[PDB]
Amino acid sequence: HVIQKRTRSESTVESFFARGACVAIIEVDNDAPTKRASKLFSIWKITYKDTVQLRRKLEFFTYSRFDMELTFVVTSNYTDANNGHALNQVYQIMYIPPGAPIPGKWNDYTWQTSSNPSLFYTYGAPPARISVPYVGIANAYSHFYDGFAKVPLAGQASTEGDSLYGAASLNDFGSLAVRVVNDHNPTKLTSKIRVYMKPKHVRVWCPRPPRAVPYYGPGVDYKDGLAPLPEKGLTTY
């Protein structure tokens, strides 16, 4: 007889996803707009599939439902020693839900953000942070969708009715537009905003076997690492 006082508190689906995983490194520049090699604003299609770790953890399950905590760690540097110095920068991160106008210039009217939620971050401050509820148009997030957005009908040409396999608007969450609000200093500055994503208040359904070969694209495709297992004798301890 043994008294078995061991708990599974850290293996709950809440604890399993209770971490900030980096999903995006967005690069922006503060420079004279006359310069053409400098990108004064950056647009990032919100997704967790730009990186693998959180994607693999989430794809243990078929369906999920959770709130999302986004943290933004902003770093910056000089790209040149001459041409003087710069004053502290302010960054605008505007959420563009699907349909809202997308900025084409770093200073066009869209940055008024009269209705789009916008986050203004001051360099040197603690990393910015916001929370979002569950915003899926379905009753859960679909990590996998075995279907099409269009059904090609008999008669219409091969060009019509064609959609990517497994792609649906269930994962269309808009994008993030990032810019430096300051006017350019006589010296070029380069900044990177790292986006860390934490699911909280998590529920999951339909467990799946985890990814065993390198991810290849947003789907389930595989090309290269198709021999994951090593060699080991049948009767070798």
Partner: protein, 300 residues
């Protein structure tokens, strides 16, 4: 309105207070033997003769321990009256029989795709914008007491299969919906390099389970084993599984059926031996919404 919760003290030398400051709950912080703790995830059995409509069948798993059911009024998104064909559509349809040889790498099907041309069920599926149904899948494979071999039957929700090209998600609708013939797994991945007339088809590798996961772990899905020395058949009862209460049956396949030879077929000393495998699927608790002119999807 402070919440005083208790801590679980470890290293001893005990309550902590939390207050929510925001109106939106999304702003809140996280609050935190053989018996199987997840009894529903270990392929629970129906614990004979299965009769549905005018069809009768004489080793049965209920996927996730959830029997097929109709939409609750509490969870009905569409507002128009739902069509329930009943015995007209809810009956056993027998697909084309496949042949299991010593060299077979496995077979796959999609639901409701495999039943799209099955009597009145297909008519209802193509006449309505929205459709919903569970299934009863009966796999049949009989052989003598001198045959050896094992088949693993897996019901996978959202069974997405990998493509055959460098272009991501490039499998076209026609190849992703073959109907009752289904498709076969392959022993190796072959890249389609015909940039002029790409096949745009799947390349499901058996040991990768066609989706980049090791086949050995496919047992986490609802499953049943047909071991030729023990049983002839396998019954899988699949409830409707989706992120929505009802969806488009033509656009989306809710389930996938995979049959993989876990142990290769063998017999006496005849290297030439083949036994048929027959699938009989009965949709269950069918309901459809959004009646209009019939859909005619593009073929070939």
């Amino acid at each position: 309105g402070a919440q005083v919760s208790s801590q679980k003290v470890g290293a001893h030398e005990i309550n902590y207070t939390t207050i929510n400051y925001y109106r939106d709950s999304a702003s809140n912080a996280a609050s935190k033997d053989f018996a199987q703790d997840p009894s529903k995830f270990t392929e629970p059995v129906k614990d004979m003769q299965l009769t549905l409509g005018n069809s009768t069948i004489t080793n049965s798993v209920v996927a996730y321990g959830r029997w097929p059911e109709y939409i609750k009024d509490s969870e009905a998104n569409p507002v128009d009256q739902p069509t329930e064909p009943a015995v007209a559509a809810c009956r056993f349809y027998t697909l084309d029989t496949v042949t299991w040889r010593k060299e077979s790498r496995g077979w796959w099907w999609k639901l409701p795709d495999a039943l799209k041309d099955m009597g009145l069920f297909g008519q209802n599926m193509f006449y309505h914008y929205l459709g919903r149904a569970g299934y009863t899948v009966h796999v049949q494979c009989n052989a003598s007491k001198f045959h050896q071999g094992a088949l693993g039957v897996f019901a996978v929700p959202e069974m997405c299969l990998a493509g055959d090209s460098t272009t991501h998600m490039f499998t076209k609708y026609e190849n992703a919906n073959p109907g009752e013939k289904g498709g076969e797994f392959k022993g190796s991945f072959t890249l389609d390099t015909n940039a002029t007339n790409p096949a745009r088809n799947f390349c499901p590798v058996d040991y990768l389970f066609g989706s980049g996961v090791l086949a050995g772990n496919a047992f986490v899905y609802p499953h049943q084993i047909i071991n030729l020395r023990t049983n002839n058949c396998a019954t899988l009862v699949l409830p409707y599984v989706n992120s929505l209460s009802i969806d488009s049956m033509t656009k989306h396949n809710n389930w996938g059926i995979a049959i993989l030879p876990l142990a290769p077929l063998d017999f006496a000393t005849e290297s030439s031996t083949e036994i048929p495998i027959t699938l009989t699927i009965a949709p269950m608790c069918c309901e459809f919404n959004g009646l209009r002119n019939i859909t005619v999807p593009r073929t070939q």
